[PDB]
Design a protein around this ligand. Structure first.
Ligand SMILES: [Zn+2]
Ligand SMILES: [Zn+2]
Length: 218
């Protein structure tokens, strides 16, 4: 497998890409962000592993950044795998109350800090965690960077197909996607967990895929 990749998207915003061999299934490629605000770095999703979470943290700590906080966009291991390691390093971890409940139900380590607001703001006015409603999972949130007009759609944004529906809410996905398109249609870039970054048409495409997926299910 490829090693952890970190690439600059633009000033202050990096995409981290990690790779997992899923036994009996195939290989999963997962994108998240590192967001720099002054001398602080925020991880938007952890890699699958403690190993890769540490490599990612060390890359930014060696450039002088504090890892100020991490946000997990949903309970799946491709957003949360590194939480236990981060908690051991006293790096504040955040996830919604629902995400923490789903982690606990699967016997996984919880984020230290939780929230249930529909919007939760980090770095005062620079990092918005938003819940559009169920889709890919019950608990999926997106992360908006208003100063860059970049949306981290995570694993909710699926412009080319819905992927694994095991934990999905197909009935809710269309409305959640319509809510997301209506609020973040001004987006310059939409970063997805499993596909290449796109423009704001990734939101409409996800809505189309969710509508199509629901209808095929019926
Ligand atoms: Zn997922
Ligand atoms: Zn994912």
């Amino acid at each position: 497998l490829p090693n952890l990749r970190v690439e600059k998207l633009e000033e202050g915003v990096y995409v981290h890409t990690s790779y997992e061999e899923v036994k009996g299934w195939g290989v999963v490629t997962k994108h998240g962000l590192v967001v720099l605000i002054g001398a602080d770095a925020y991880l938007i999703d952890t890699p699958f592993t403690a190993k890769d979470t540490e490599k990612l943290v060390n890359w930014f700590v060696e450039r002088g950044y504090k890892i100020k906080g991490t946000v997990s966009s949903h309970f799946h291991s491709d957003s949360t795998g590194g939480i236990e390691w981060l908690n051991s390093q006293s790096i504040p971890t955040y996830a919604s109350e629902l995400t923490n409940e789903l982690l606990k139900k699967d016997g996984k380590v919880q984020a230290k800090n939780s929230f249930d607001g529909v919007s939760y703001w980090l770095a005062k006015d620079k990092i918005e965690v938003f819940y559009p409603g169920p889709g890919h999972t019950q608990d999926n949130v997106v992360v908006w960077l208003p100063e860059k007009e970049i949306l981290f759609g995570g694993c909710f944004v699926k412009p080319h197909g819905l992927g694994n529906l095991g934990d999905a809410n197909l009935e809710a996905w269309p409305e959640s996607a319509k809510i997301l398109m209506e609020k973040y249609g001004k987006a310059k870039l939409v970063v997805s967990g499993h596909s290449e970054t796109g423009d704001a048409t990734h939101l409409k495409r996800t809505w189309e895929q969710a509508v199509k997926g629901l209808k095929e299910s019926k």
